[PDB]
Amino acid sequence: KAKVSVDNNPVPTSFEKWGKPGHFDRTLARGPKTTTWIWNLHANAHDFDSQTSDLEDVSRKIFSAHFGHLAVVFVWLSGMYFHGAKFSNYEGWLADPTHIKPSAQVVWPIVGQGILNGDVGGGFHGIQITSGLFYLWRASGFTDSYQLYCTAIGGLVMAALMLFAGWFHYHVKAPKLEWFQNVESMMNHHLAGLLGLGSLGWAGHQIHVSMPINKLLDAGVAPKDIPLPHEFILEPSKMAELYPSFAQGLTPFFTLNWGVYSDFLTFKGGLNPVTGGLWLSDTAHHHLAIAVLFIIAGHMYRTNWGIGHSMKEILEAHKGPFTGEGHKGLYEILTTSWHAQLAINLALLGSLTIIVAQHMYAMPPYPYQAIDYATQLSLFTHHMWIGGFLIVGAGAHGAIFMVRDYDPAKNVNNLLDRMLRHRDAIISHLNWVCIFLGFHSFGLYIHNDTMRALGRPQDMFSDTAIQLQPIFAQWVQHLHTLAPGATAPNALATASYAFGGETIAVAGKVAMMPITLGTADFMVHHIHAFTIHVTALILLKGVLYARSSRLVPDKANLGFRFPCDGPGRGGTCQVSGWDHVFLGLFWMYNSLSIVIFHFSWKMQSDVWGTVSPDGSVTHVTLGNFAQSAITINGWLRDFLWAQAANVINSYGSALSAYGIMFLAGHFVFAFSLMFLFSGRGYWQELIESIVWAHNKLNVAPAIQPRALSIIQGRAVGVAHYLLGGIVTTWAFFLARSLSIG
Amino acid sequence: SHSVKIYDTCIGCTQCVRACPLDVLEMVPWDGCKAAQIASSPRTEDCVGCKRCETACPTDFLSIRVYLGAETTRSMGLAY
Amino acid sequence: ALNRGDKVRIKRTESYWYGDVGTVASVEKSGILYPVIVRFDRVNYNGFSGSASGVNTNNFAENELELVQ
Amino acid sequence: DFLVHHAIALGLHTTALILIKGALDARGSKLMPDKKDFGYSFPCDGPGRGGTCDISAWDAFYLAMFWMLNTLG
Amino acid sequence: AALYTHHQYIAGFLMVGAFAHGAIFFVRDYDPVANKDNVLARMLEHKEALISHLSWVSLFLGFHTLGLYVHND
Amino acid sequence: MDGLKSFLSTAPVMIMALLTFTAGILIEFNRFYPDLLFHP
Amino acid sequence: ELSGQPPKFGGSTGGLLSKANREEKYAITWTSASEQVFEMPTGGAAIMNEGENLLYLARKEQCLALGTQLRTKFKPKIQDYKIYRVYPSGEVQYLHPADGVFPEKVNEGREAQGTKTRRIGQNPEPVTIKFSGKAPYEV
Amino acid sequence: DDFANLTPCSENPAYLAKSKNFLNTTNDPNSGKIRAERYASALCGPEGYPHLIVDGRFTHAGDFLIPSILFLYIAGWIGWVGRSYLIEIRESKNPEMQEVVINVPLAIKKMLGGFLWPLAAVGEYTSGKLVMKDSEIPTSPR
Ligand code: CLA
Ligand code: CLA
Ligand code: CLA
Ligand code: CLA
Ligand SMILES: CCCCCCCCCCCCCCCC(=O)OC[C@H](COP(=O)(O)OC[C@@H](O)CO)OC(=O)CCCCCCCCCCCCCCC
Ligand SMILES: CC1=C(/C=C/C(C)=C/C=C/C(C)=C\C=C\C=C(C)\C=C\C=C(C)\C=C\C2=C[C@H](C)[C@H](O)CC2(C)C)C(C)(C)C[C@@H](O)C1
Ligand SMILES: CC1=C(/C=C/C(C)=C/C=C/C(C)=C/C=C/C=C(C)/C=C/C=C(C)/C=C/C2=C(C)CCCC2(C)C)C(C)(C)CCC1
Ligand SMILES: CC1=C(C/C=C(\C)CCC[C@H](C)CCC[C@H](C)CCCC(C)C)C(=O)c2ccccc2C1=O
Ligand code: SF4
Ligand code: SF4
Q: Where are the beta strands (DSSP E) in A240-286?
A: none
User: CA separation (Å) from E24 to A410, A710, C14, D36, E10?
Assistant: 58, 27, 22, 10, 21
Nearest-angstrom CA–CA distance, A125 and A106 = 7
Residue of chain E minimizing CA distance to H134: E46
Q: How many CA atoms lie within 13 A of A606 on its CB side?
A: 19
Helix, strand and coil percent figures for chain G, each rounded to 5: 15, 25, 55
Nearest-angstrom CA–CA distance, A580 and A392 = 10
The β-bridge partners of A609 are A619
- Residue H78 touches partner A, C-beta closer than 8 Å: no
Strands G51-57 and C57-60: unpaired
Bond from prior residue into G97 cis (ω within 30 degrees of 0): yes
Q: Do F38 and H100 touch (CB under 8 A)?
A: no
What are the residues whose beta carbons fall under 8 Å from the beta carbon of H95, sequence distance 6 or more?
A702, H89
Strands B26-29 and C8-10: unpaired
Measured distance between the N- and C-terminal CA atoms of chain G, rounded to whole angstroms: 43
- Residue G119 touches partner C, C-beta closer than 8 Å: yes
Asked if A681 and D55 count as a contact pair (C-beta separation under 8 A), the reply is yes
What are the residue boundaries of the structural domains of chain H, listed by start? 2-142
Q: How many Cβ atoms are within 10 Å of A680's Cβ, its own excluded?
A: 26
Residue F35 has its nearest CB partner, among H35, H52, H66, at: H35
Q: Which residues of A touch B57 (CB under 8 A)?
A: none
Q: Do G120 and C12 touch (CB under 8 A)?
A: no
List the determination method.
Answer: cryo-EM
Nearest-angstrom CA–CA distance, A658 and A664 = 9
Superfamily for domain range G1-138: Photosystem I PsaD, reaction center subunit II (3.30.1470.10)
- Angle ∠(G57,G61,G65) on CA atoms, nearest 5: 90
The dihedrals phi and psi of A430, each to the nearest 5 degrees, come to -65, -40
Judged by phi (left if over 0) then psi (alpha if -120 to 50, else beta), residue A83 lies in alpha
Q: How many CA atoms lie within 13 A of B10 on its CB side?
A: 33
CA distance D37 to chain C (A): 13
Nearest-angstrom CA–CA distance, A691 and A677 = 24
What are the residues whose beta carbons fall under 8 Å from the beta carbon of H72, sequence distance 6 or more?
none
Nearest-angstrom CA–CA distance, G121 and A306 = 77
Measured distance between the N- and C-terminal CA atoms of chain A, rounded to whole angstroms: 63
Nearest-angstrom CA–CA distance, A350 and A347 = 5
Q: Do H139 and E48 touch (CB under 8 A)?
A: yes
What's the gap between Cα A53 and its chain centre?
Answer: 33
Q: Is A69 in the pocket of ligand 2 (CB under 6 A)?
A: no
Nearest-angstrom CA–CA distance, A56 and A174 = 9
Nearest-angstrom CA–CA distance, E11 and E18 = 11
Residue of chain C minimizing CA distance to A704: C42
Asked if B30 and G112 count as a contact pair (C-beta separation under 8 A), the reply is yes
Nearest-angstrom CA–CA distance, A241 and A250 = 16
Computed from CA positions of residues D32, D37, D42, D46, in that sequence, does the dihedral angle turn out positive or negative? negative
- CA nearest B53: which of A303, D20, D49, H133? D49
Nearest-angstrom CA–CA distance, A721 and C42 = 35
What are the residues whose beta carbons fall under 8 Å from the beta carbon of A717, sequence distance 6 or more?
A672, A673, A675, A676
For the residues of B34-80, what is the DSSP string, one character each? Answer: TT-EEEE-TTGGG-----HHHHH--SSS-SEEEE--S--HHHHT---
What are the residues whose beta carbons fall under 8 Å from the beta carbon of D7, sequence distance 6 or more?
E61, E65
What are the residues whose beta carbons fall under 8 Å from the beta carbon of H33, sequence distance 6 or more?
H22
**H-type alpha helices, A168-275:** 177-180, 183-188, 197-205, 211-218, 229-234, 236-242, 251-254
Measured distance between the N- and C-terminal CA atoms of chain C, rounded to whole angstroms: 12
What are the residues whose beta carbons fall under 8 Å from the beta carbon of A58, sequence distance 6 or more?
A48, A49, A52, A338
Helix (H, G, I), strand (E, B) or coil at G33: coil
The β-bridge partners of A173 are A8
Q: For H4, which DSSP code? A: T
Nearest-angstrom CA–CA distance, A113 and A127 = 11
Nearest-angstrom CA–CA distance, A371 and A506 = 7
Q: Is B33 annotated as a binding residue?
A: no
- Residue A18 touches partner F, C-beta closer than 8 Å: yes
Strands A6-8 and A173-175: antiparallel
Nearest-angstrom CA–CA distance, A278 and A504 = 12
Nearest-angstrom CA–CA distance, H20 and G139 = 83
The β-bridge partners of A6 are A175
Asked if E40 and E32 count as a contact pair (C-beta separation under 8 A), the reply is no
Q: What is the 3-state secondary structure (H, E, C) of A661-674?
A: HHHHHHHHHHHHHH
Strands A609-611 and A617-619: antiparallel
- CA nearest D65: which of H107, E9, H116? E9
- CA nearest C16: which of A112, D30, A462, H81? D30
Q: Residue C26 is which amino acid?
A: S
Measured distance between the N- and C-terminal CA atoms of chain E, rounded to whole angstroms: 28
User: CA separation (Å) from G10 to A317, G43, G89?
Assistant: 22, 11, 28
Q: Is B19 in the pocket of ligand 10 (CB under 6 A)?
A: no
Helix (H, G, I), strand (E, B) or coil at D46: coil
- CA nearest A206: which of A272, A251, A268, A265? A265
The β-bridge partners of C23 are C39
Asked if B43 and G83 count as a contact pair (C-beta separation under 8 A), the reply is no
Q: Do E51 and D21 touch (CB under 8 A)?
A: yes
Chains in contact with G, counting 3 or more C-beta pairs less than 8 Å apart as contact: A, B, C, D, E
Nearest-angstrom CA–CA distance, E62 and E47 = 22
Asked if A162 and A254 count as a contact pair (C-beta separation under 8 A), the reply is no
Selected residue of D53, D55, D61, D70 to mutate for chain A interface (largest A Cβ count, 10 A) = D53
Q: Which ligand is nearest to the CA of B38?
A: 10
**H-type alpha helices, chain D:** 2-25, 57-72
- CA nearest G85: which of G9, G12, G6, G23? G23
H/E stretch holding A6 reads strand A6-8
**Which residue range forms the structural domain that includes residue F9?**
1-40
**List of domains in chain A:** 3-741 (1.20.1130.10)
A190 CA → ligand 1 middle, Å:
7
Nearest-angstrom CA–CA distance, A303 and A301 = 6
Long-range contacts of A175-179 (CB under 8 A, 24+ apart): A175/A4, A175/A5, A175/A6, A175/A7, A175/A59, A175/A60, A175/A63, A176/A5, A176/A6, A176/A7, A176/A56, A177/A55, A177/A56, A177/A59, A178/A3, A178/A5, A179/A3, A179/A4, A179/A5, A179/A6
Nearest-angstrom CA–CA distance, G51 and G4 = 8
Helix (H, G, I), strand (E, B) or coil at A175: strand
Compute chain C's Rg from CA coordinates. 12
Helix (H, G, I), strand (E, B) or coil at G27: strand
- CA nearest A367: which of A602, A133, A206? A133
Helix, strand and coil percent figures for chain F, each rounded to 5: 70, 0, 25
Atom of ligand 8 nearest to the CA of F19: 23
- CA nearest A684: which of G85, H45, F18, C54? C54
Asked if A11 and A170 count as a contact pair (C-beta separation under 8 A), the reply is yes
Asked if A127 and A83 count as a contact pair (C-beta separation under 8 A), the reply is no
Assign domain H2-142 to a CATH class.
mainly alpha
User: CA separation (Å) from A677 to A286, A725, C50, D11, D71?
Assistant: 53, 17, 19, 18, 17
Computed from CA positions of residues A213, A214, A218, A219, in that sequence, does the dihedral angle turn out positive or negative? negative
What's the gap between Cα A302 and its chain centre?
Answer: 33
Of H111, H117, H126, which is best to mutate to test ligand 6, by the most ligand atoms within 8 angstroms of its C-beta? H117
Instruction: Find the CATH number of the domain harbouring F25.
Output: 1.20.5.510
Helix (H, G, I), strand (E, B) or coil at H7: strand
What are the residues whose beta carbons fall under 8 Å from the beta carbon of A165, sequence distance 6 or more?
A67
Measured distance between the N- and C-terminal CA atoms of chain B, rounded to whole angstroms: 18
Q: How many Cβ atoms are within 10 Å of E29's Cβ, its own excluded?
A: 10
What are the residue boundaries of the structural domains of chain G, listed by start? 1-138
Nearest-angstrom CA–CA distance, E63 and E52 = 16
Taking a contact as any Cβ pair under 8 Å apart, which residues of chain G between 68 and 127 contact chain A? 68-69
Q: Which residues of A299-322 are buried (b: 16+ CB within 10 A; e: fewer)?
A: ebbbbeeeeeeebbeebbeeeeee
Asked if A507 and A514 count as a contact pair (C-beta separation under 8 A), the reply is no
A194 CA → ligand 1 middle, Å:
7
Asked if H142 and D27 count as a contact pair (C-beta separation under 8 A), the reply is yes
Strands C57-60 and G25-32: unpaired
Asked if A727 and A664 count as a contact pair (C-beta separation under 8 A), the reply is yes
Nearest-angstrom CA–CA distance, D49 and F31 = 52
CA torsion A307→A308→A312→A314, rounded to 10°?
A: 140
User: CA separation (Å) from G99 to B4, B47, G115?
Assistant: 21, 19, 20
Nearest-angstrom CA–CA distance, H5 and H22 = 25
CA distance F24 to chain H (A): 16
Asked if G5 and G52 count as a contact pair (C-beta separation under 8 A), the reply is yes
